[PDB]
Amino acid sequence: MSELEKAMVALIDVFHQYSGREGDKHKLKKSELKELINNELSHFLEEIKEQEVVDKVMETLDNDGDGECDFQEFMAFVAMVTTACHEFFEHE
Amino acid sequence: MSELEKAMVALIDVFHQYSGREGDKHKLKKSELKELINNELSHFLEEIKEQEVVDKVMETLDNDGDGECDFQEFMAFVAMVTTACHEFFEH
Numbered sequence: 129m130s131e132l133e134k135a136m137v138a139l140i141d142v143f144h145q146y147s148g149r150e151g152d153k154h155k156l157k158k159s160e161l162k163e164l165i166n167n168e169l170s171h172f173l174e175e176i177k178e179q180e181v182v183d184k185v186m187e188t189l190d191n192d193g194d195g196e197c198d199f200q201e202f203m204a205f206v207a208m209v210t211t212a213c214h215e216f217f218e219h220e
Numbered sequence: 221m222s223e224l225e226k227a228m229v230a231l232i233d234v235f236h237q238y239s240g241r242e243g244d245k246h247k248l249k250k251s252e253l254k255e256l257i258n259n260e261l262s263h264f265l266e267e268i269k270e271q272e273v274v275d276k277v278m279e280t281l282d283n284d285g286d287g288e289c290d291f292q293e294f295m296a297f298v299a300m301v302t303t304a305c306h307e308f309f310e311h
C-alpha cells in the first residue's frame with residue numbers, strides 16, 4: 129500500500145479498535161471516544177480529564193443525535209482535527 | 221506518534237506533495253489530482269486514463285467551484301474513499 133492508502137486503513141482500524149469495546153460494536157460511546165482521544169491523539173489534542181469535555185466533544189461530532197459517534201461522524205472528526213493541525217502550521 | 225496521528229500527517233503530506241506541483245501550491249488542479257489518484261490510490265481506485273473521468277472527479281469534489289481541490293475538499297475525498305474501503309471489507 130501507498131502512504132495514503134495505509135493512512136486510510138489506519139483510520140478504519142483505530143475506529144474499530146475503540147468502537148468494538150462496548151455496546152454497538154460500530155459506534156463510539158463517550159467512554160470509547162475519550163479513550164481514543166487520550167491514547168491516540170496525545171500529540172494533537174489536550175488530554176481529556178473532565179466529564180464536561182468528553183460531553184462537549186460528543187455533542188459536537190454527533191450529527192444524528194443518538195449520543196454516539198458512528199463511522200461517518202468519526203470521519204468528520206478526523207477531518208476537523210487534521211484541518212486544525214494543517215492550519216495551525218501555516219503560514220511560515 | 222500513534223498510528224492515527226501518523227495517518228493524519230500522511231494526509232497533509234500527500235496533499236502538499238501533489239498540490240505544490242503546479243499553479244496554486246496549495247490546491248490540486250486536475251492534473252495534480254489525476255496523478256494523486258493514479259499513484260497513491262492505485263489499490264483502492266481504478267486508474268484514471270480518460271479526461272472525462274478526471275473532469276467528473278474534480279467536479280464532484282470541488283464544492284466551492286474554483287476548478288481546484290483545496291485541503292478541505294481533499295479531506296472530504298479521503299472520507300469518501302475511506303468509507304468505500306470500509307464497506308468493501310464488510311459483509
Ligand SMILES: [Ca+2]
Nearest residue numbers: 147150152155
Ligand atoms: Ca461501542
Ligand SMILES: [Ca+2]
Nearest residue numbers: 190194196197
Ligand atoms: Ca451519532
Ligand SMILES: [Ca+2]
Nearest residue numbers: 239242244247
Ligand atoms: Ca497546484
Ligand SMILES: [Ca+2]
Nearest residue numbers: 282285286288
Ligand atoms: Ca474548490
Ligand SMILES: [Zn+2]
Nearest residue numbers: 144154306310
Ligand atoms: Zn466497520
Ligand SMILES: [Zn+2]
Nearest residue numbers: 214218236246
Ligand atoms: Zn498547507
